[PDB]
């Protein structure tokens, strides 16, 4: 899975086991491990909390 850190670099990594890979579609927000950098979770998308504070 070709991915890109939002603060920097780009990677090709994989999911856990049961992460529903089909539900990863380009334009989705995902989570990666720290050390092995493997996909751990995908989340519903960001807020940028200017949305929250109003």
């Amino acid at each position: 899975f070709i991915v890109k850190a939002t603060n920097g670099p780009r990677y090709v990594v994989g999911c856990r086991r049961q992460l529903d890979k089909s539900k990863l579609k380009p334009g989705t927000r995902v989570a990666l491990d720290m050390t092995t950098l493997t996909i751990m979770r995908y989340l519903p998308r960001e807020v940028d909390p200017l949305v929250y504070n109003m």
């Binding site: 890109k4 670099p9 780009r10 990677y11 090709v12 990594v13 994989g14 092995t36 950098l37 493997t38």
Partner: protein, 55 residues
């Protein structure tokens, strides 16, 4: 020299009979180790792939 001209022929003949058996078995083992070499190329990576670009 009809006493040992013709009988020393077997002397250096038995040995390459045995090497003729032997190099077969060494080829029989190096395919194994060739497979070990090829698989041990791929134990370190190609799940954790990072991205650069060629220059």
């Amino acid at each position: 020299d009809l006493y040992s001209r013709y009988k020393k022929l077997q002397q250096e003949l038995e040995f390459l009979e045995v090497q003729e058996e032997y190099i077969k078995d060494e080829q029989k083992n190096l395919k194994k180790e060739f497979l070990h070499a090829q698989e041990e190329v791929k134990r370190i990576q190609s799940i954790p792939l990072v991205i650069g670009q060629f220059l």
